[PDB]
């Protein structure tokens, strides 16, 4: 079924501690973002019409643009 | 004005008697009274509601307080007067009287049929108004015979901190008679007057 | 910089002087909600569709709309024993007195 | 800790389980009969032969709690609401022991069992409010099955 | 300036978000949003919970003991969305809680 | 009936234009608070047990203390 | 201004009044027949003798609107969804006049009447979505009483 | 590479014919072709969906395009070739053909009984697929006689921007026959083949 | 200007 | 210490 909540939970679990005052914030954040993008992509069909899913996809893409995360890279 | 009396002390003598003693600093050694002064002793407890102080004049530095309730906490204070001169009431001293055997029976004896169990009765009551000490138990006496001598009644001893008791295995559609008595560290109080309860019968469906 | 959470909030009716009409309880734990509602909203913040969209838009452009807000999403009653206008002792469930969950709305 | 509330007024009963009932319960009846406390009431028909009854006596037994209080008994009747236990005391145990106290509604604060008991006279009758911790309110032996505050009234009394 | 809790405009353009690849209609709608101060006393139309009444009181008496209540949607309405579903079919569905109808302090 | 919402509506209507950064906030506020106190007192009996009422009474009293608004006044 | 929506799909009808209906409506039927627009559909039984019908033709007449558009006719059929009006034009009136236009769903934007018309082929049949301003959607003469989008289908067609 | 042709112009001659003309800047004064170059003209319209361009080679700087649809907008562009050298397609020019009388009948003629009014029929139709111009009206012919000569049929003229019409005062439980024809600024199109509809009868309650 |  |  639609499993966007798992993707989001993973992303929140992985990044909740991150604080921009520490050195590797942006790299760890971009890694988590790429993983979040990948997880959401793999449940795209089941989630069609779920605003949580569509908002995740767009918000992820926008955050990756804002934080300058390469679309390809480590997770 | 006049200096109030000091060292007010309550000496417990019995369930109804307490001796009060005090010192007067204005007085010479051995509390020798060499003038027309007199003392006033006042006392009360908090039971029942809104009691007023009892008073007594004393010619010397002691007073025996009688007719007090058993196992009761009383407050005592003293003042001095000399014609025109009068002091304020001293610091209060307290004294609790000794216990006495209960002098009144348990009250409001109520007997009911247990719901769904008509061969079981529930006995409910209220303490004696004159418990005269910590109730350590009650005794419930019951009989099918209203004229049976007291020693022939079924005895059901019970704790003193409970006011409900259940009696099982009784006969249906039968009159039963109940009496209760309280007990304390001093002994048995009087028995309540017998209460009648007829057990229910069956309502065939 | 804490994220939306249920936090302690102790209500003391006696400190408020309400013990002239409230019999019991004279205090209770009401809790309160506080904290950031950030994209992405975890499932337990239970956003409405509207909150989902608003959080998204505020993420993409904070000038376009403010973030969603951390507020009670589930509450429970407490039973209050009190005296009413006619000097009757009343026991009543006061609805929505205790935060059970917080979320972003 | 969570609190359970019991009430009796003009009789009408509000149980720890929030069931509201109108009970006749004439004579002496246990509201509470547990490991820590005994609450006993006397109810009288408002007029002879009436099924409507009201409270003329409230007895509270605060059972002895080693190191906190000796056994204390409170009793109020119509036109006699003292601010003291039957022995004339206003607190349990020693002078220093304030785990059990009475203040003038007359209120009993049994801190040691997280219990409050409010008693007042409304007209010719008495009202009662009890706040008790759930685990203590439900702490009683099998034979203590008649407790108006726990199970409400027998069906035949309603 | 610090306005009190009010409903404000919020225009949602699904085409600008790229969602027109699955949404057919509408491609935009007015969602509104809530914003502004929740101050003692809460006006009746802010329709507070008992909890919000107490919290607003406590924040008024001691702003350090509790934060203020928050201006959030208290009534929302759906919009009907025509979209291409997961089976690639046209579906018309009410999306609940899409439009703010009233704001209040919670 | 409990008419606390009338009192509150009046108070909110009367103070809605007040901007804390404008020069006469406290004097108009106190007059308003005093009227709010009076209005809530006139419906007190009907409102016992109404949390909106009890909160209003206490909130008003606290604000009048915070802002040093005299008990009596215009 | 507030918008009313009409839909026809696999037939099933969603009216401007949000009533959802399943109609047979075999042959040519008017969805819209008002002062500004004519929407005409042809429905065919899915198999012979079936009460379940589906759309094989959609005709839209954008009536002449002086200074904005000359009359334009759009027609789509199963396996023929053009991105132009029957005269090969993609816009109403002049080259400068963009009050009426078609874009490839194929969509018609009649800005001059705040109206949008979306047409697509789902499998062997056609679907239709119409967004129209309420005052314009309800602007029609007494004799224009057959309009599936306004009043739904005759009871005998459901 | 090679410079594309310029000044592409569409001269409308009829409902199916358009003459295309263009200039070549690479050419000398008076546009005289003095080498082995040839031009390619391409054209299409947007009706029906997914049409492909039609092409034609031209020895000179003009080309007559025939067999076009009436009242249709076409696009035209030109390119030049010289053995190995080939230019890109020029800027496009447009041209709309003239109207022609409709050449096909109205379609999908459907006749229904009006709800609650069984003496009223509703006639619904679709335009001719070959309208060949703006439809200015339709004519509905109806009869109870299937063999009646066309001039004996009841005539019901109708606007061209409507595809539904109501006919009142008809006889119940009676077969009726319907024919429709379209009209434009050029005249009358053909009539659709008669459709039969029997009016309903009464269902006595 | 034509716009609704 | 006695407190519940
Ligand atoms: C991303 O790049 C832009 C442009 O250089 C810069 O302004 C911004 O601060 C960068 N942000 C991060 C998180 O790297
Ligand atoms: C004590 O003496 C005074 C003065 O003679 C007198 O007025 C008062 O009534 C006496 N008290 C008692 C208890 O007799
Ligand atoms: C035009 O000429 C070229 C070269 O001879 C040829 O390949 C092409 O097919 C011709 N086009 C047409 C439309 O005949």
Author numbering:
A (entry chain D): 53 to 127
B (entry chain E), H (entry chain F): 884 to 1088
C (entry chain A): 397 to 501
D (entry chain c), G (entry chain d): 158 to 167, 169 to 262, 268 to 321
E (entry chain B): 396 to 501
F (entry chain C): 53 to 126
I (entry chain T), J (entry chain S): 138 to 141
What wording appears in the published article?
Repulsive guidance molecules (RGMs) are cell surface proteins that control processes ranging from brain development to iron metabolism. Structural analysis of RGMs and their complexes with NEO1 and BMP2 revealed a common RGM architecture comprising an N-terminal domain (RGMND) essential for BMP binding and a C-terminal domain (RGMCD) sufficient for NEO1 binding.
In the complex, the GDF5 dimer binds to two RGMB ectodomains in a similar arrangement to that in the binary RGMBND–GDF5 complex. RGMBCD is sandwiched between GDF5 and NEO1. A hydrophobic face of RGMBCD (Phe162–Phe166, Arg172, Tyr268–Glu270, Phe281, Ala292) interacts with a hydrophobic region of GDF5 (Ile419–Leu422, Val485–Tyr487, Leu477–Ile479). The 2:2:2 NEO1–RGMB–GDF5 architecture is compatible with a potential arrangement of RGMs, NEO1, and GDF5 on the cell surface. C termini of RGMB and NEO1 point in the same direction and could be accommodated on the surface of one cell to control downstream signaling.
